[PDB]
C-alpha cells in the first residue's frame, strides 16, 4: 500500500462546532472550539453558550453530542471513522432516560483541511420538572462501553450510560447511536467494543463556558 495513512486524518486536528436545539421548550445555541489527537483517541473543546443561557437543564446531557475519529483504534480492529475521511460521515442518536426524558441528536461532520467542522442538533423532550435534568442535579457521565456492530447493514453502537448524580444516586440512559459515512463503500468494521470516558474539566458557574475532555480506546474486548 502506497498511501499516506494520514491523508486527511492528521495527528493533531482542530475542532470546530455550533450546536443549536431545545430541551423541554428551552432553546439554545452553543458554539465549539477544540483540539484533538485521533491516533490517541484524545481531545478537548471550549464550549460557550451563545444563546439561551443561563440553560435550565443539567449541562451533562449535551456533551456526548459535541466524534468517533477520536478513537484509539488498533490495528487488526477496522477503523470506519477515519475511514470516512476526508468526505466524513454523520450520526444520529437516541437518548433514553429511566424517568422518561427522551432527547434525539444528530451532528454532521465534514473536514476542510485541518479542521473538523461539526453541525450538531439536539432536541430533548419528556424530562419531568421535578427530575435531576430539570433540577441541575447531576455530577457526571460515568466512564463506559459502547458496544459497536452492524445492525439491518448499518454501523451501529448501544451503551448503558449512567449519569452519577449528588446524594450517591445515579440516573441512567440507554443510547443506540446510527453511523453513516458519507461516501458509499466504506467498509463496515467487525464488531468491537469503545471504552469512553468524557468529563468537565472546568466550567463557570452557570455553564456559560465549559471546558470539555474525553478518552476512547476500541478494543476486541
Given at each position: ?93 437516541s437518548l433514553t432516560f429511566?424517568?422518561?426524558?427522551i ?70 440512559c440507554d ?47
Amino acid at each position: 500500500d502506497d498511501k499516506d495513512p494520514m491523508s486527511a486524518i492528521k495527528p493533531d486536528m482542530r475542532i470546530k462546532l455550533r450546536m443549536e436545539g431545545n430541551v423541554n421548550g428551552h432553546h439554545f445555541v452553543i458554539d465549539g472550539d477544540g483540539t484533538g489527537k485521533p491516533y490517541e483517541g484524545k481531545q478537548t473543546m471550549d464550549l460557550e453558550v451563545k444563546e439561551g443561557g443561563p440553560l435550565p437543564f443539567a449541562f451533562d446531557i449535551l456533551t456526548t453530542a459535541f466524534n468517533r475519529v477520536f478513537v484509539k483504534y488498533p490495528d487488526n480492529i477496522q477503523d470506519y471513522f477515519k475511514q470516512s475521511f476526508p468526505k466524513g460521515y454523520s450520526w444520529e442518536r437516541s437518548l433514553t432516560f429511566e424517568d422518561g426524558g427522551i432527547c434525539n441528536a444528530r451532528n454532521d461532520i465534514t473536514m476542510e483541511g485541518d479542521t473538523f467542522y461539526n453541525k450538531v442538533r439536539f432536541y430533548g423532550t419528556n424530562f419531568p420538572a421535578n427530575g435531576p435534568v430539570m433540577q441541575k442535579k447531576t455530577l457526571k457521565w460515568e466512564p463506559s462501553t459502547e458496544k459497536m456492530y452492524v445492525r439491518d447493514g448499518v454501523l451501529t453502537g448501544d451503551i448503558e450510560m449512567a449519569l452519577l448524580l449528588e446524594g450517591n444516586a445515579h440516573y441512567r440512559c440507554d443510547f443506540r447511536t446510527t453511523y453513516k459515512a458519507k461516501e458509499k463503500g466504506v467498509k463496515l468494521p467487525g464488531a468491537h467494543f469503545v471504552d469512553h470516558a468524557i468529563e468537565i474539566l472546568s466550567h463557570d458557574k452557570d455553564y456559560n463556558k465549559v471546558k470539555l475532555y474525553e478518552h476512547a480506546v476500541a478494543h476486541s474486548g
